[PDB]
């Protein structure tokens, strides 16, 4: 009886640069932020509607820093979670906002089955994110 998503987690390579992206550029509100010292990890918990986004990452300055492997994008993406789409009122306007922040967003396309406007953009590690009406 799986009622609702509780949270979606993601991995990032540079915790600082990604914090700046998710919190300061994309504007997500921070619920909590915790250092997990014997994980060589930080856990950053963001609010997105009624679910949480958990961002896991290390700072480049950490003494035990090891960069995670890069995401597989070509020729084929791997099995597992592929991309995350956010619901917005105005894809065109949110698209412009992103672009104003210096984030590149691909051209507006239409959902294949609903016709709703949508547009892809990428987090610093190339994670495909989507704006979707």
Q: Say whether residue 51 binds Zn ion (CB under 5 A).
A: no
Number of Cβ within a 10 Å radius of residue 112: 7
Q: Are 30 and 45 in contact (CB under 8 A)?
A: yes
Q: Say whether residue 109 binds a copy of itself (CB under 8 A).
A: no
Q: Say whether residue 32 binds a copy of itself (CB under 8 A).
A: yes
Q: Say whether residue 36 binds a copy of itself (CB under 8 A).
A: yes
Min. distance of Cβ 110 from a copy of itself in angstroms?
Answer: 14
> Among 16, 17, 23, 45, which residue sits at the site for a copy of itself (rule: CB under 8 A)?
45
Q: Are 91 and 108 in contact (CB under 8 A)?
A: yes
Two tokens at 2? 């799986």
Binding mask 112-131 for a copy of itself (x = CB under 8 A): xx-----------xxx--xx
d(CA 69, CA 42): 17
Two tokens at 31? 């619920």
Q: Say whether residue 5 binds Zn ion (CB under 5 A).
A: no
Please give the angle made by the CA atoms of 23, 29 and 131, to the nearest 5 degrees: 70
Min. distance of Cβ 77 from a copy of itself in angstroms?
Answer: 6
Q: Closest Cα to residue 36, out of 13, 20, 11, 56?
A: 56
Residues annotated in a binding site: 7, 54, 83, 130
Q: What residues line the site for a copy of itself (CB under 8 A)?
A: 1-13, 26-28, 32, 34, 36, 40, 43, 45, 48-51, 54, 56, 66, 68-72, 76-89, 94, 112-113, 125-127, 130-132
């Amino acid at each position: 009886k799986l009622k609702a998503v509780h949270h979606v987690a993601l991995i990032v390579s540079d915790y600082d640069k990604s914090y700046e992206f998710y919190v300061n550029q994309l504007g997500f509100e921070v619920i909590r932020e915790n250092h997990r010292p014997k994980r060589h990890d930080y856990k950053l918990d963001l609010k997105c509607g009624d679910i949480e986004l958990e961002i896991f990452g290390n700072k480049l300055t950490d003494s035990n820093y090891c960069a995670p492997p890069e995401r597989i994008s070509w020729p084929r993406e791997a099995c597992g979670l592929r991309h995350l789409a956010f619901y917005v009122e105005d894809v065109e306007a949110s698209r412009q906002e992103l672009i104003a922040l210096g984030i590149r967003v691909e051209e507006v396309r239409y959902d294949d089955y609903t016709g709703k406007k949508m547009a892809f953009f990428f987090d610093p590690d190339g994670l495909p994110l989507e704006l979707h009406e």
